[PDB]
Ligand binder design. Structure first.
Ligand SMILES: c1ccc2[nH]ccc2c1
Length: 267
């Protein structure tokens, strides 16, 4: 019967890894589609178009990408195109943002000619609510691809991944840089490191942090500090910026849990 539990455990752990991999593929595909959409905006924005055409392109970009909460454009040679667009409930609000290029991070993207990424942060939206997310920056180029003429900044809403992570389920965690919880069913965990939340189980947490750094995947067990019951745990990393080459392209991670007692209670 000890061998019964062992074969139950193996079966459960494998199915968790299968379920988690499909979930990672779902989240990656959301990101990849947004990146593809950004790539098309990046090409179209520097062409000779009306200012209103550019604005409406950025609005439609937001409308077509449910996980984007805002977008900005900056042009070196044009003060009239230093604009930020943010979701404003049913509409999209336009705002002037003249210092948009005068920060060290925007300059980084434009000097490097490469995709750049911020760390997760809370952005104040037009209605005064805060949205947790990350900025992705791409340099805007001239048609001859040798001169950078500006920058596109895309605010990806981490909170909008509730659709994949917390909608009608509470067994998933989205984890980011150095073990920060980006999204989980328990809202109070957001922006806190797993090293703090799960300090009661340092062996399991250090193992998760090592997998996060090394870009791997694994299963393990741990005593959950909220339920006080042992859980099965599967984790899997993926490159947050995808195949795109950049020093800012680090691993995100999705974690899936199952309470051990519930597996064994079924037998
Ligand atoms: C360490 C231990 C348990 C955990 N559950 C989710 C992340 C995580 C890290």
């Amino acid at each position: 019967n000890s061998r019964v539990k062992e074969i139950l455990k193996e079966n459960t752990l494998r199915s968790m890894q299968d379920s988690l991999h499909f979930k990672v593929k779902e989240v990656q595909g959301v990101l990849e589609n947004t990146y593809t959409s950004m790539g098309i905006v990046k090409e179209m924005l520097p062409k000779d178009t009306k200012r209103e055409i550019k604005i409406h392109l950025l609005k439609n970009f937001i409308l077509a990408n449910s996980h984007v909460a805002g977008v900005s454009m900056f042009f070196k040679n044009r003060e009239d195109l230093r604009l930020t667009l943010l979701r404003d409930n049913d509409t999209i609000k336009l705002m002037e943002n003249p210092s948009l290029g005068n920060n060290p991070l925007a300059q980084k993207a434009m000097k490097n000619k490469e995709i750049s990424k911020s760390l997760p942060y809370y952005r104040k939206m037009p209605n005064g609510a805060e949205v947790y997310g990350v900025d992705i920056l791409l340099p805007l180029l001239n048609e001859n691809a040798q001169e950078v003429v500006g920058a596109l900044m895309v605010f990806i809403s981490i909170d909008s991944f509730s659709n994949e992570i917390t909608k009608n389920r509470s067994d998933l965690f989205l984890i980011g840089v150095k073990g920060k919880v980006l999204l989980s069913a328990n809202k109070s965990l957001q922006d806190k490191p797993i090293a703090e939340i799960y300090k009661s189980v340092p062996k399991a947490t250090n193992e998760v942090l090592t997998i996060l750094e090394n870009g791997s995947k694994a299963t393990l067990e741990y005593l959950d500090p909220f339920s006080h019951k042992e859980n099965f745990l599967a984790v899997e990393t993926f490159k947050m910026l995808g195949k795109a080459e950049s020093k800012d392209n680090l691993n995100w991670m999705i974690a899936l849990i199952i309470e051990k007692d519930k597996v064994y209670e079924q037998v």
